[PDB]
Structure 1
Amino acid sequence: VQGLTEEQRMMIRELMDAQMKTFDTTFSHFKNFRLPGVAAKWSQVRKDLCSLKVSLQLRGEDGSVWNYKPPADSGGKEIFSLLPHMADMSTYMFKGIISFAKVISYFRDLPIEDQISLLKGAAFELCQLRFNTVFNAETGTWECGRLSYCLEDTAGGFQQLLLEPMLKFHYMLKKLQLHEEEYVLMQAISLFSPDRPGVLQHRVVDQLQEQFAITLKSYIECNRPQPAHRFLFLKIMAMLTELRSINAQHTQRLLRIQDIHPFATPLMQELFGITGS
């Protein structure tokens, strides 16, 4: 129930309300998305693209199932086949994240230039945090309603996958068995990083972030006494630091792939600083 102040409990209520209003957990309104059709840069792009191999499944409302197994790298443009779809899913998630931020009072009250700077800085991280809540660790599958993204069983097993930092993050974060309140506090802490590029109100954003972190620390103290949740707050704060690193890494991968194979949606260009010229 509580153990927090009035301000902390209202802070959680507003974040949970924003999450409820802007997170389409069944992905019902993700429609009209593209599907894979029926010189030293490339070597790096090829290494970037095969770091995440997923099969894709569509369950029809009628009960039909479409299933897609991707191709192995044969030395050409077939490794780009899932990029338009993933760009459309990313764009759909980004829209939910932007709406999430905009209905938060602490975010509305910041200058619009800081809003844009914080969203540009954190949108990828909040997308990852939401994707973890639909991640099934036992089946290696992100269950997005009628869409499923299954990690391709590969030599090395579920331990070679954990070498990919994005996949280790999702498995490790899932192992913590966080509450909805803790996930949405992680989103706030990430969205309120005072040191994003181009932030002006460093002091205000830092004070807001510290309050979201203290609320999280206090929430864990009051509602998780079990020995398994010892240092849970510090584990969460270390995963947020890792997520920031994965954010920087995946931003470089994106810019390299985009350099030789353009695929970013207009909203992705806006968030990752691509002007169109």
Structure 2
Amino acid sequence: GLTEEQRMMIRELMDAQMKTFDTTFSHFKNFRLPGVAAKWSQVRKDLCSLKVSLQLRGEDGSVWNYKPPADSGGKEIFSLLPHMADMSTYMFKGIISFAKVISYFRDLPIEDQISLLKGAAFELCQLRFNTVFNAETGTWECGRLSYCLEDTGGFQQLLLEPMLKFHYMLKKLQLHEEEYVLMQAISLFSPDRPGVLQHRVVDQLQEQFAITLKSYIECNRPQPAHRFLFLKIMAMLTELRSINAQHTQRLLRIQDIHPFATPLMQELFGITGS
């Protein structure tokens, strides 16, 4: 029951997703790995909230496993930062390529493209990561890389971290590929990001992506479990925006006392190099 324009709109987004999302992470390579005063207290809280072990499955059948150190009041809490910087950079590139393929994005002024990507790159990265999240094992399955949440409390204590609660709650909605990519579009075309000039154009595009999503759900999900699903998704996007703001401040705090951001991360977060 979608209109012609809505069916074309979903197809272009699905097309962009297919072309730019390396779902097996086969081209993520050359990444760094861990080696073989009230600020620090806050940075310690910042880093200790998302602790993961790492596994690497070699193409030959070998397996490397990394278990992170406990916080002992030292630099060891930074040991996974270079690797995560490389992974974030890889995802950011796919997100930039995603936006560039979309006609509605490419027709915006170049200054607004940059402002929208700076505002939504993290959110779109999280949305893509959720599609490889395994909620039963607490693992992001990134092809031959796996990131497994470290035990602690149990899961209920882990779900107090908002980013982890977001991933579990979003996964439980059991969304289709089309609903994920419409969420990426609504997030990308947010008219209220810092520096956006064509505010009215972006707002109208966002409204159309949300209408298409509302219509998609109504045409393809009649089950009582999916009542209010559209409103649940919009609430998740509002929460993802809040998480985006928390993560930025948390990144800038860590960067203030222990630099790690790659050049592309610096560009996206307003770090000038000076």
Shorter-normalised TM-score: what interval? over 0.9
Per-residue CA deviations over 1:112-147 (Å, capped at 9, x if unaligned) read 000000000000000000000000000000000000
Within-5 A mapping of 1:183-198: 183-198=180-195
**How far apart, in 2, do the equivalents of 1:46 and 1:79 lie?**
7
Q: C-alpha displacement at 1:158, in angstroms? A: 0.9
Partner of 2:209: 212
Q: Residue in 2 aligned with 1:181?
A: 178
* Cα deviations by residue, 1:88-120 (Å, 9 ceiling, x for unpaired): 000000000000000000000000000000000
- Give the whole-Å Cα distance in 1 for the aligned partners of 2:107 and 2:40: 44
> Residue 56 of structure 2 aligns to a residue in which SS?
strand
Output one character per residue of 1:193-227: Cα deviation in whole Å (capped at 9) or x when no partner: 00000000000000000000000000000000000
Of residues 154, 159, 172, the one that matches 2:156 is 159
CA distance in 2, matches of 1:266, 1:38: 26
- Report whether the alignment pairs 1:132 with 2:134: no
1:244 and 1:267 map into 2 onto residues whose CA distance is 21
Matched residues in 1 for 2:218 and 2:141: separation?
31
What does the per-residue CA deviation read over 1:171-199, in whole Å, with 9 as the maximum and x for residues that have no partner?
Answer: 00000000000000000000000000000
In 2, Cα distance between equivalents of 1:260 and 1:159: 31
TM-aligned CA deviation for residue 153 of structure 1: 1.0
State how far apart, in whole Å, the 2-side matches of 1:175 and 1:161 are.
Answer: 16
1:134 and 1:253 map into 2 onto residues whose CA distance is 24
3-state SS in 2 of match to 1:251: helix
**Per-residue Cα deviation, 1:42-64 (whole angstroms, up to 9, x for no partner):** 00000100000000000000100
Q: What secondary structure is seen at the aligned counterpart in 2 of 1:30?
A: coil
Aligned-partner Cα distance in 2 for 1:51–1:161:
8
Report the 3-state secondary structure (helix = DSSP H, G, I; strand = E; otherwise coil) of the residue aligned with 1:25: coil
Equivalent residue in structure 2 for 1:70, among 68, 74, 87:
68
Give me the whole-angstrom Cα distance separating, in 2, the residues matched to 1:75 and 1:51. 15
- Distance, in Å, in 1 between the alignment partners of 2:44 and 2:238 is 27
Q: SS at the partner of 1:57?
A: strand
The CA deviation at 1:39 is 1.1
1:263 equivalent to 2:260? Answer: yes
SS of equivalent to 2:146: strand
The alignment partner of 2:159 has SS state of helix
- Deviation at residue 230 of structure 1 after TM alignment: 0.2
* Superposition deviation, residue 28 in structure 1: 0.1
Deviation of the 1:40 alpha carbon: 1.1
Shift of 1:66: 0.2
Structure 1 unaligned blocks of 5 or more = none
Q: How high is the sequence identity, in percent, across the aligned residues?
A: 100
**Matches of 1:167 and 1:64 in 2, distance apart?**
30
Please report how far the alpha carbon of residue 4 of structure 1 lies from its aligned counterpart in structure 2 after TM superposition: 0.3
Q: Find the partner of 1:236 among 209, 233, 236.
A: 233
Distance 1:157 1:75 in 2: 24
Structure 2 CA distance for aligned equivalents of residues 233 and 20 of structure 1:
23
> Structure 2 regions of 5+ residues with no counterpart?
none
Counterparts of 2:154 and 2:74 in 1: how far apart (Å)?
Answer: 27
Partner of 2:250: 253
Q: Which runs of 4+ in 1 moved over 2 A?
A: none
CA distance in 1, matches of 2:124, 2:45: 25
What SS is found at the alignment partner of 2:201? helix
Residues 150-183 of structure 1 show CA distances to partners (whole Å, capped at 9, x for unaligned) of 00011x1111111000000000000000000000
CA distance in 2, matches of 1:256, 1:158: 27
- Aligned equivalents of 1:198, 1:253: Cα separation in 2: 22
Q: How many residues align?
A: 274
- Aligned counterparts of 1:95 and 1:180: Cα–Cα separation in 2: 20
